[PDB]
Amino acid sequence: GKLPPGPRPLPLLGNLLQMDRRGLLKSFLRFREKYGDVFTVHLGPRPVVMLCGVEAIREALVDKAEAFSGRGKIAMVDPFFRGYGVIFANGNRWKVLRRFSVTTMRDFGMGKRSVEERIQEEAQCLIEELRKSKGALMDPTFLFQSITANIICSIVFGKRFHYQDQEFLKMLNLFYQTFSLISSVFGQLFELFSGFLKHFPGAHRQVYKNLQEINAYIGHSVEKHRETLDPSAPRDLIDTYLLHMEKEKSNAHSEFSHQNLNLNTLSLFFAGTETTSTTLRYGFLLMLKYPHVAERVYREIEQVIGPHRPPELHDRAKMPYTEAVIYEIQRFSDLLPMGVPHIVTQHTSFRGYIIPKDTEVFLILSTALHDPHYFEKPDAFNPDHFLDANGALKKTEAFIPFSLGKRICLGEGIARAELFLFFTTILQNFSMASPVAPEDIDLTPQECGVGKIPPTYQIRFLPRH
Numbered sequence: 001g002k003l004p005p006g007p008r009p010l011p012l013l014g015n016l017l018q019m020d021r022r023g024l025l026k027s028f029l030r031f032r033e034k035y036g037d038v039f040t041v042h043l044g045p046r047p048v049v050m051l052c053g054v055e056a057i058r059e060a061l062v063d064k065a066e067a068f069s070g071r072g073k074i075a076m077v078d079p080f081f082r083g084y085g086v087i088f089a090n091g092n093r094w095k096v097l098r099r100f101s102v103t104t105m106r107d108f109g110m111g112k113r114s115v116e117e118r119i120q121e122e123a124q125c126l127i128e129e130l131r132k133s134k135g136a137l138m139d140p141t142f143l144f145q146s147i148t149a150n151i152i153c154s155i156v157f158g159k160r161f162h163y164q165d166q167e168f169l170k171m172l173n174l175f176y177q178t179f180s181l182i183s184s185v186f187g188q189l190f191e192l193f194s195g196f197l198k199h200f201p202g203a204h205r206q207v208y209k210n211l212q213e214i215n216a217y218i219g220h221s222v223e224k225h226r227e228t229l230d231p232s233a234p235r236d237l238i239d240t241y242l243l244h245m246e247k248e249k250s251n252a253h254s255e256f257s258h259q260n261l262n263l264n265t266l267s268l269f270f271a272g273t274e275t276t277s278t279t280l281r282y283g284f285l286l287m288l289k290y291p292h293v294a295e296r297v298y299r300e301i302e303q304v305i306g307p308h309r310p311p312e313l314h315d316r317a318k319m320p321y322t323e324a325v326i327y328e329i330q331r332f333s334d335l336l337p338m339g340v341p342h343i344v345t346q347h348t349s350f351r352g353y354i355i356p357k358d359t360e361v362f363l364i365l366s367t368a369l370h371d372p373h374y375f376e377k378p379d380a381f382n383p384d385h386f387l388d389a390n391g392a393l394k395k396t397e398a399f400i401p402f403s404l405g406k407r408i409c410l411g412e413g414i415a416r417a418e419l420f421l422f423f424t425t426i427l428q429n430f431s432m433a434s435p436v437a438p439e440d441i442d443l444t445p446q447e448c449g450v451g452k453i454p455p456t457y458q459i460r461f462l463p464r465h
């Protein structure tokens with residue numbers, strides 16, 4: 001057959017006038033009700049194919065894995081990155097970067113303490129800071145941003161920043177601000193009309209400016225690593241990349257020099273800090289709205305781990321309720337609802353249609369996470385979505401918050417380690433309270449574009465002992 005069906009576009013405006021005024025995702029879900037699971041939407045001058053539903057997404061990403069392996073652009077950050085970094089790269093640059101990441105992290109920890117060990121160390125510092133708050137009300141956003149940023153800082157730069165460090169907090173604010181700009185109304189409009197909006201002042205310039213500033217801190221630190229590189233004591237990931245680059249420096253293959261160390265490092269921070277902290281933020285808000293849930297998670301911690309020894313990843317298999325709660329936080333929060341855009345690399349048959357080479361594809365991960373067949377009453381938060389009658393963890397093919405296939409989240413393991421360890425380490429040591437009654441807690445994101453951002457809230461952590 002040929003092109004997927006969809007709304008009739010105007011020449012310059014595409015389908016703007018058929019859009020839902022509240023955003024891209026709401027817009028696409030409305031087209032899905034009319035056109036089904038595979039459809040075309042013109043974003044400005046650009047046709048993009050949407051795949052929705054568990055079956056259609058798996059079919060593309062696993063069954064047609066290589067054709068769907070291309071990375072599409074995200075208009076708001078592409079001017080900065082320009083296809084550097086594992087996230088944004090394509091073809092050989094991408095394959096080679098991603099394989100090196102994978103092999104590097106398999107070797108990580110034989111030489112130096114493991115990623116789990118670094119996450120436990122950070123969780124330790126967190127709970128001492130929460131203790132130090134002495135039950136004061138706080139917006140936990142900055143702390144949650146700090147802990148996830150510190151895990152990447154520890155892997156990449158071999159150091160941690162203190163929670164009160166002003167230069168650290170300044171940098172974190174620049175990221176946070178960058179992510180809310182990307183997902184703002186303007187950021188979604190840039191997604192459609194970057195071709196002419198780029199000529200004007202606006203949030204896209206502020207984003208470029210923020211990224212330039214961040215990449216300057218990174219570059220300076222990378223330069224200090226080169227200047228002080230000691231081959232017999234490599235300190236961190238940056239030292240590992242440097243030493244490799246020096247050894248492979250002579251020959252231009254799997255060439256480092258079609259790479260950019262600074263941009264790759266920045267993209268690690270970009271992917272690594274925000275979704276995890278936003279997941280944490282959403283998860284504690286959810287625990288405030290459904291307090292019996294946090295209470296049941298504590299009972300399992302008390303039973304399997306106790307009050308004295310630190311949570312460990314080995315504990316996960318013995319804590320089905322807590323795993324179900326974290327899966328439900330991710331499923332409900334739906335933090336990258338349209339995932340990250342793909343492109344089909346060659347003309348591709350798909351469910352009777354033919355998708356042209358180089359067409360952008362959005363896989364609407366949200367529609368898998370909310371599929372009613374898999375999740376009875378999918379718009380409500382309920383950990384029983386991931387539990388069988390016997391209370392064991394019930395895994396499902398619908399649960400794809402990290403996506404699938406060739407491009408599946410590179411930090412899936414790390415992200416899962418952080419969520420489990422931060423969640424359980426905080427809850428081992430503290431109960432939580434807020435001044436706002438559950439009925440007055442609204443869980444509606446304050447922004448929903450590329451990323452979902454939870455509303456602001458206050459919380460206090462009360463020591464158990």
Ligand code: HEM
Pocket residue numbers: 071086087088098268271272273275276279335336339340341365401402403404406407408409410411412414415
């Ligand atoms: C709970 C937190 C996280 C969620 C929900 C998440 C989800 C995702 C999703 C949906 C994608 C797009 C996959 C695709 O293109 O189909 C992605 C990509 C990616 N993620 Fe994450 N992610 C999380 C945390 C992390 C962390 C902590 C890191 C860094 C260690 C990371 C690194 C990356 C990278 C490098 C990519 C690009 C992969 C590629 O293009 O080959 N992510 N993630």
Ligand SMILES: Clc1ccc(-c2cnc[nH]2)cc1
Pocket residue numbers: 074077087182270271272275340409450451
């Ligand atoms: Cl624009 C954009 C792209 C990728 C991510 C991401 C990947 N993994 C975690 N976050 C976030 C935002």
